[PDB]
Design an enzyme around this catalytic site. Structure first.
Site, PDB file in Angstrom:
ATOM      1  N   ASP A 125       0.809  -1.225   0.000  1.00 56.12           N
ATOM      2  CA  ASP A 125       0.000   0.000   0.000  1.00 56.12           C
ATOM      3  C   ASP A 125       0.837   1.266   0.000  1.00 56.12           C
ATOM      4  O   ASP A 125       1.669   1.480   0.878  1.00 56.12           O
ATOM      5  CB  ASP A 125      -0.922   0.031   1.211  1.00 56.12           C
ATOM      6  CG  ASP A 125      -2.055  -0.975   1.108  1.00 56.12           C
ATOM      7  OD1 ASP A 125      -2.349  -1.450  -0.013  1.00 56.12           O
ATOM      8  OD2 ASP A 125      -2.654  -1.296   2.150  1.00 56.12           O
ATOM      9  N   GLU A 133     -16.340   0.041   5.780  1.00 57.08           N
ATOM     10  CA  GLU A 133     -17.407  -0.907   5.520  1.00 57.08           C
ATOM     11  C   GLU A 133     -17.956  -1.500   6.820  1.00 57.08           C
ATOM     12  O   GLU A 133     -17.204  -1.751   7.754  1.00 57.08           O
ATOM     13  CB  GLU A 133     -16.872  -1.992   4.575  1.00 57.08           C
ATOM     14  CG  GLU A 133     -16.761  -1.454   3.148  1.00 57.08           C
ATOM     15  CD  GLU A 133     -15.646  -1.978   2.298  1.00 57.08           C
ATOM     16  OE1 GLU A 133     -14.913  -2.928   2.735  1.00 57.08           O
ATOM     17  OE2 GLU A 133     -15.522  -1.328   1.182  1.00 57.08           O
ATOM     18  N   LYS A 156     -21.797   1.502   3.754  1.00 61.47           N
ATOM     19  CA  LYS A 156     -21.121   0.670   2.768  1.00 61.47           C
ATOM     20  C   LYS A 156     -21.118  -0.778   3.293  1.00 61.47           C
ATOM     21  O   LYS A 156     -20.647  -1.023   4.380  1.00 61.47           O
ATOM     22  CB  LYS A 156     -19.686   1.186   2.542  1.00 61.47           C
ATOM     23  CG  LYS A 156     -18.867   0.409   1.534  1.00 61.47           C
ATOM     24  CD  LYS A 156     -19.574   0.457   0.246  1.00 61.47           C
ATOM     25  CE  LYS A 156     -18.927  -0.278  -0.905  1.00 61.47           C
ATOM     26  NZ  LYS A 156     -19.429   0.236  -2.169  1.00 61.47           N
ATOM     27  N   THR A 181     -21.034  -2.993  -3.729  1.00 64.37           N
ATOM     28  CA  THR A 181     -19.841  -3.146  -4.525  1.00 64.37           C
ATOM     29  C   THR A 181     -20.043  -4.316  -5.504  1.00 64.37           C
ATOM     30  O   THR A 181     -21.154  -4.890  -5.619  1.00 64.37           O
ATOM     31  CB  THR A 181     -18.633  -3.283  -3.612  1.00 64.37           C
ATOM     32  OG1 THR A 181     -17.444  -3.250  -4.376  1.00 64.37           O
ATOM     33  CG2 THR A 181     -18.660  -4.575  -2.769  1.00 64.37           C
ATOM     34  N   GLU A 198     -20.583   0.523  -6.164  1.00 65.49           N
ATOM     35  CA  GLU A 198     -19.221   0.729  -6.648  1.00 65.49           C
ATOM     36  C   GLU A 198     -18.756  -0.488  -7.419  1.00 65.49           C
ATOM     37  O   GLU A 198     -19.328  -1.584  -7.311  1.00 65.49           O
ATOM     38  CB  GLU A 198     -18.300   0.940  -5.460  1.00 65.49           C
ATOM     39  CG  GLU A 198     -18.632   2.147  -4.648  1.00 65.49           C
ATOM     40  CD  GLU A 198     -17.860   2.265  -3.315  1.00 65.49           C
ATOM     41  OE1 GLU A 198     -18.050   3.307  -2.649  1.00 65.49           O
ATOM     42  OE2 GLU A 198     -17.067   1.339  -2.938  1.00 65.49           O
ATOM     43  N   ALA A 232     -15.794  -3.245  -7.476  1.00 62.84           N
ATOM     44  CA  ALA A 232     -14.891  -3.831  -6.482  1.00 62.84           C
ATOM     45  C   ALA A 232     -13.423  -3.647  -6.862  1.00 62.84           C
ATOM     46  O   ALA A 232     -12.590  -3.340  -6.009  1.00 62.84           O
ATOM     47  CB  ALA A 232     -15.193  -5.320  -6.315  1.00 62.84           C
ATOM     48  N   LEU A 233     -13.103  -3.881  -8.136  1.00 65.86           N
ATOM     49  CA  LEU A 233     -11.739  -3.919  -8.595  1.00 65.86           C
ATOM     50  C   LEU A 233     -11.557  -2.943  -9.762  1.00 65.86           C
ATOM     51  O   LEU A 233     -12.499  -2.634 -10.479  1.00 65.86           O
ATOM     52  CB  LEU A 233     -11.345  -5.342  -9.015  1.00 65.86           C
ATOM     53  CG  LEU A 233     -11.327  -6.384  -7.903  1.00 65.86           C
ATOM     54  CD1 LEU A 233     -11.077  -7.786  -8.505  1.00 65.86           C
ATOM     55  CD2 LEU A 233     -10.249  -6.044  -6.852  1.00 65.86           C
ATOM     56  N   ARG A 274     -11.074   4.028  -9.387  1.00 65.93           N
ATOM     57  CA  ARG A 274     -10.999   5.375  -8.804  1.00 65.93           C
ATOM     58  C   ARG A 274     -10.252   6.253  -9.794  1.00 65.93           C
ATOM     59  O   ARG A 274      -9.672   5.782 -10.783  1.00 65.93           O
ATOM     60  CB  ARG A 274     -10.346   5.457  -7.417  1.00 65.93           C
ATOM     61  CG  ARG A 274      -8.894   5.246  -7.327  1.00 65.93           C
ATOM     62  CD  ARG A 274      -8.321   5.554  -5.911  1.00 65.93           C
ATOM     63  NE  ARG A 274      -8.728   4.523  -5.000  1.00 65.93           N
ATOM     64  CZ  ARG A 274      -9.533   4.645  -3.932  1.00 65.93           C
ATOM     65  NH1 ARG A 274     -10.021   5.811  -3.534  1.00 65.93           N
ATOM     66  NH2 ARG A 274      -9.833   3.559  -3.261  1.00 65.93           N
TER      67      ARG A 274
HETATM   68  C1  J5B Z   1     -14.809  -1.822   0.049  1.00 70.00           C
HETATM   69  C2  J5B Z   1     -14.452  -0.828  -1.034  1.00 70.00           C
HETATM   70  O1  J5B Z   1     -14.833   0.561  -0.883  1.00 70.00           O
HETATM   71  C3  J5B Z   1     -12.951  -0.958  -1.306  1.00 70.00           C
HETATM   72  C4  J5B Z   1     -12.098   0.280  -1.525  1.00 70.00           C
HETATM   73  O2  J5B Z   1     -11.240   0.563  -0.399  1.00 70.00           O
HETATM   74  C5  J5B Z   1     -10.299   1.623  -0.618  1.00 70.00           C
HETATM   75  O3  J5B Z   1     -10.947   2.825  -1.056  1.00 70.00           O
HETATM   76  C6  J5B Z   1     -11.880   3.407  -0.119  1.00 70.00           C
HETATM   77  C7  J5B Z   1     -12.534   4.595  -0.794  1.00 70.00           C
HETATM   78  O4  J5B Z   1     -11.543   5.543  -1.187  1.00 70.00           O
HETATM   79  C8  J5B Z   1     -11.174   3.747   1.201  1.00 70.00           C
HETATM   80  O5  J5B Z   1     -12.115   4.246   2.180  1.00 70.00           O
HETATM   81  C9  J5B Z   1     -10.502   2.483   1.718  1.00 70.00           C
HETATM   82  O6  J5B Z   1      -9.788   2.741   2.916  1.00 70.00           O
HETATM   83  C10 J5B Z   1      -9.531   1.921   0.672  1.00 70.00           C
HETATM   84  O7  J5B Z   1      -8.855   0.765   1.206  1.00 70.00           O
END
Ligand code: J5B
Length: 487
Positions: free
Chosen positions: A97, A182, A291, A338, A376, A378-379, A416
């Site tokens: 990350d 979530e 979420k 998602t 949203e 997922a990937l 994103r």
């Molecule tokens: C579960 C789904 O929203 C996965 C995305 O997680 C990443 O992006 C969100 C939204 O920007 C963040 O809150 C999260 O911490 C990220 O890991």
């Protein structure tokens, strides 16, 4: 002929470091240039994490909104609407990350004398990404409970961001309720014990949750009951365990009681925090959302093992999402789901994965409870097939030529924004997707107006919520393919 009621709004998630790990807005010119591309594409708005660890990093109530106000001004000056996530969780923290933003250090300091503020697994491992729901009402944090901290943060957000609310910039508040924002337990901690498609683990061993289970079990005359001990470990499959195997102990009286307790606690966590959020935002023209994580793996097997360990008590004869939806109803809260982009055929066979059916279940559950439902991806996906799968889920019965369709997503948020999205073939595909989501109409800045948020209706009991679990109903029918593909 008037296809206006078919329009589905499209939002785009901002980068995780839209605000720097130092709580400074330092990528404004880059973001402005990217937002120009989103506006050229007709996007309705953007979504952003409002990180607790950035804003309340100094100390209790020492809120520093400077960077977020700069960001929100930029978004307003781009003519875009804004969905704000109350991000009460750690960003990143896993191997690989790039953007890593913990919850506030002074909150974590409480964990030195009280490590049970964190969700804990059966081997004692503490997850430091989020505070256990078991401390929601425990006054551990310099006199405040976790729910009080969340309410106070939202209150300060409302006060500081009032002009953006009143101007119609901020239109949705997504209330973070766990890891990754979530409403779930951290049952699949990637790089901290789990790899896909492991069944995951129950993360209920913190002392607060153990005491709560003990009390719950005592109330029904079973003080001796304990958490199940035949559940294997993170990277097992269901048949490796007596609990989750076909005809396993998940079906027993003790199994049902534990699963109900575990999943009910998540529901109660959401209800109590949403009640506070509703009080904060009362009278503003916003929607409140939660979420729900998309646990598609093991959906095809009887135990739905990964859903269970995440906290979604979902079985062939038990709707573990309609219960959540029923809890949301009094708040007039929406579901943000998602997996909108996934086909079952894109998943590995061994994962026993059914994202399409899971999406259909959650959307149908929300609609049956009268909720707005958004989704949203997922990937990361840039390809027409993904966009066409999103389009199918956005209007499951296709286009109504003369009025609103029977069901539709209230919105879609794309994960994103990056430089990769807004160039080349990726950008061309994305723009056409937005056109199709909008039913080939131009952007409508007036679409889907929100009434001033009314106060939550009467609190309903867990037993009342659970009426929604059974009988399990078939989903509404979904077209195999969109009637308005990208091409
Ligand atoms: C579960 C789904 O929203 C996965 C995305 O997680 C990443 O992006 C969100 C939204 O920007 C963040 O809150 C999260 O911490 C990220 O890991």
């Amino acid at each position: 002929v008037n296809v206006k009621g078919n329009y589905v709004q499209v939002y785009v998630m901002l980068p995780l470091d839209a605000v720097s790990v130092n709580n400074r807005f330092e990528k404004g010119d880059e973001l402005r240039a990217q937002l120009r591309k989103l506006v050229e594409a007709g996007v309705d708005g953007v979504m952003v994490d409002v990180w607790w660890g950035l804003v309340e990093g100094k100390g209790p109530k020492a809120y520093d909104w400077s960077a977020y106000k700069q960001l929100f001004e930029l978004v307003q000056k781009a003519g875009l609407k804004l969905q704000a996530i109350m991000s009460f969780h750690q960003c990143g923290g896993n191997v690989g990350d790039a953007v890593n933003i913990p919850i506030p250090q002074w909150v974590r300091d409480v964990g030195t004398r009280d490590p049970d503020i964190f969700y804990t697994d059966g081997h004692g491992t503490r997850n430091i990404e989020y505070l256990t729901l078991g401390v929601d009402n425990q006054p551990l944090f310099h006199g405040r409970s976790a729910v009080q901290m969340y309410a106070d943060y939202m209150t300060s957000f409302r006060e500081n961001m009032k002009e953006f609310l009143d101007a119609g910039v901020i239109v949705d508040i997504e209330v973070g309720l766990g890891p990754a924002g979530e409403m779930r337990y951290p049952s699949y901690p990637q790089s901290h014990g789990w790899s896909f498609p492991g069944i995951g683990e129950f993360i209920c061993y913190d002392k607060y949750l153990q005491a709560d289970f003990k009390a719950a079990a005592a109330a029904v005359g079973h003080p001796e009951w304990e958490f199940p001990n035949d559940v294997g470990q993170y990277n097992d499959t269901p048949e490796r365990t007596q609990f989750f195997r076909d005809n396993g102990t998940y079906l027993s009286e003790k199994g049902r009681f534990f699963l109900a307790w575990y999943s009910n606690n998540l529901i109660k966590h959401g209800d109590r925090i949403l009640d506070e959020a509703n009080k904060v935002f009362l009278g503003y023209k916003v929607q409140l959302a939660i979420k729900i994580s998309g646990i598609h793996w093991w959906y095809k097997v009887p135990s739905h093992a990964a859903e269970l360990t995440a906290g979604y008590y979902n079985l062939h004869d038990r709707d573990g999402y309609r219960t959540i939806a029923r809890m949301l109803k009094r708040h007039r809260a929406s579901i943000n789901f998602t997996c909108a982009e996934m086909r079952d055929s894109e998943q590995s066979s061994q994962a026993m994965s059914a994202p399409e059916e899971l999406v259909q279940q959650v959307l149908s559950a929300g609609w049956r409870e009268g909720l707005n439902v958004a989704c949203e991806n997922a990937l990361p996906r840039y390809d027409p097939t993904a966009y066409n799968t999103i389009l199918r889920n956005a209007r499951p019965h296709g286009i109504n030529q003369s009025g609103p369709p029977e069901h539709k997503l209230f919105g879609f948020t794309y994960l994103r924004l990056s430089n990769q999205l807004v160039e080349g073939q990726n950008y061309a595909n994305f723009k056409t997707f937005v056109d199709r989501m909008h039913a080939n109409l131009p952007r409508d800045p007036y679409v889907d107006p929100m009434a001033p948020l009314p106060r939550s209706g009467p609190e309903i009991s867990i037993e009342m919520i659970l009426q929604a679990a059974q009988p399990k109903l078939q989903p509404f029918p979904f077209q195999e393919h969109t009637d308005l593909p990208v091409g």
